[PDB]
Design a protein around this ligand. Structure first.
Ligand code: HEM
Ligand SMILES: CC[C@H]1OC(=O)[C@H](C)[C@@H](O[C@H]2O[C@@H](C)C[C@@H](N(C)C)[C@@H]2O)[C@@H](C)C[C@H](C)C(=O)/C=C/[C@H]1C
Length: 393
């Protein structure tokens, strides 16, 4: 059992050599997370993509031998932690809200949010700012809160709970945040009842109240929860990891500046090169699964290392090169299979507008620290920075 916690911040800042060393030995490996959990790692692009869509690897915790606390189980009835037919039923309820054509209707508002955030950032007299606090945090939480009807005075506490899910000071802090967020979301759901709101949460409340078999009260809470959480840390870190990739590769930043039509491909390579999802969410084999002689027993926890899949040289030649013109087709930053990210059009819209605004409105935009001075969070599932100091003229 490889102890990942004994590797320190070096593994948090640069986990790729560790994953690559494992991939040379095999596709499946028993590890111990820095937090102390014994899980399986699936490495290698071909194996990673296959396991993500393999129905033998369930996402329902009824198939897991890991126990859930009361706070964890209260938020567990969501589409990401379900199999068919429950997953099919839950995703159908909101699939129309997140299509490309429906998300495109949010472009004027997303552009307005980015414009105002860049306005306040450019007001700095020294021309310096933390891109995390100035743009990477507020943009996604503002977009998803307006969509789901989360009032502004409640959004600050929502980020604190999210922070406790990724980098808790102690395991009890993560449990308290889950219990507090569940209590808040239930109160928020109750506040929509009978108010004739037209936000997404108001519509879900009416759907659940009209037919509890189509959306139970537990699944109503789980739906609000997963829609608000699954896209927060990921979108925040895509903007930050992507801008870090651009600013730490000046040749690519200048190429994008000279030809802004490469914007969409650059964002795709940001997902490929430094995607926010280091490893996919929990998967449990319903039966023993043989992966090239390595048998993963039923009920064990399996983490698909998307970060290693994106550095497999047979799939992405010269994998450690950040190339905004690279053929990025087939990356797993949004997953693969029935659980493929429902928010991918919205995430791409937010990232594309944010990156374009920073390049067009920050003359001589630059990383205000050395790459070695940046600090990465030690979470096996999320790849994200503590801060992104930047400067401009
Ligand atoms: C940078 C942006 C994003 C990235 C990299 C990302 C990544 C992912 C990945 C990898 C999965 C599948 C996880 C697995 O199979 O274990 C997923 C699923 C999901 N994502 Fe995202 N996501 C992003 C943005 C968003 C946003 C903004 C929302 C909210 C509207 C969202 C909502 C969801 C939901 C609800 C699922 C579960 C889908 C299902 O199980 O069918 N995501 N995402
Ligand atoms: C796009 C998927 C995001 O993943 C999540 O939202 C996962 C499911 C959630 O994972 C875990 O959160 C813990 C607080 C409890 C845990 N469970 C085992 C009791 C649950 O599965 C995130 C909230 C946690 C990670 C750190 C995260 O923020 C990642 C977000 C996306 C990858």
């Amino acid at each position: 059992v490889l102890d990942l916690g004994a590797l320190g911040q070096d593994f948090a800042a640069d986990p790729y050599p560790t994953y690559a060393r494992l991939r040379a030995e095999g596709p499946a490996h028993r590890v111990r997370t820095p937090e102390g959990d014994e899980v399986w790692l699936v490495v290698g692009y071909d194996r990673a993509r296959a396991v993500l869509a393999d129905p033998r690897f369930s996402k329902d915790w009824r198939n897991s031998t890991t126990p859930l606390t009361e706070a964890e189980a209260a938020l567990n009835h969501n589409m990401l932690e379900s199999d068919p037919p429950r997953h099919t039923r839950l995703r159908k309820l909101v699939a129309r809200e997140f299509t490309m054509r429906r998300v495109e209707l949010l472009r004027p508002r997303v552009q307005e949010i980015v414009d105002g955030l860049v306005d306040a950032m450019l007001a700095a007299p020294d021309g310096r700012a933390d891109l995390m606090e100035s743009l990477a945090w507020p943009l996604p939480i503002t977009v998803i809160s307006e969509l789901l009807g989360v009032p502004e005075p409640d959004r600050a506490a929502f980020r604190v709970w999210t922070d406790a899910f990724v980098f808790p000071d102690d395991p009890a802090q993560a449990q308290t945040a889950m219990a507090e967020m569940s209590g808040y979301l239930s109160r928020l759901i109750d506040s929509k009842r009978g108010q004739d709101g037209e936000d997404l949460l108001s519509a879900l409340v009416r759907t659940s109240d009209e037919d509890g078999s189509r959306l139970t009260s537990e699944e109503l809470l789980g739906m609000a929860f997963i829609l608000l959480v699954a896209g927060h840390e990921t979108t925040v870190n895509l903007i930050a990891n992507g801008m870090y990739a651009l600013l730490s590769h000046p040749d690519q930043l200048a190429a994008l500046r000279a030809d802004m039509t490469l914007l969409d491909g650059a964002v795709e390579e940001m997902l490929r090169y430094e995607g926010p999802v280091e490893s996919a969410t929990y998967r449990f084999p319903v039966e023993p699964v043989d992966l090239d002689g390595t048998v993963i027993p039923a009920g064990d926890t399996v983490l698909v290392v998307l970060a290693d899949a994106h550095r497999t040289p047979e799939r992405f030649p010269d994998p450690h090169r950040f190339d905004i013109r690279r053929d990025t087709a087939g990356h797993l930053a949004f997953g693969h299979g029935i659980h493929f990210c429902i928010g991918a059009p919205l995430a791409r819209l937010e990232a594309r507008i944010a990156v374009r605004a920073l390049l067009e409105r920050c003359p001589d935009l630059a990383l205000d620290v050395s790459p070695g001075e940046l600090v990465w969070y030690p979470n096996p599932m999320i790849r994200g920075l503590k801060a992104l100091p930047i400067r401009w003229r």
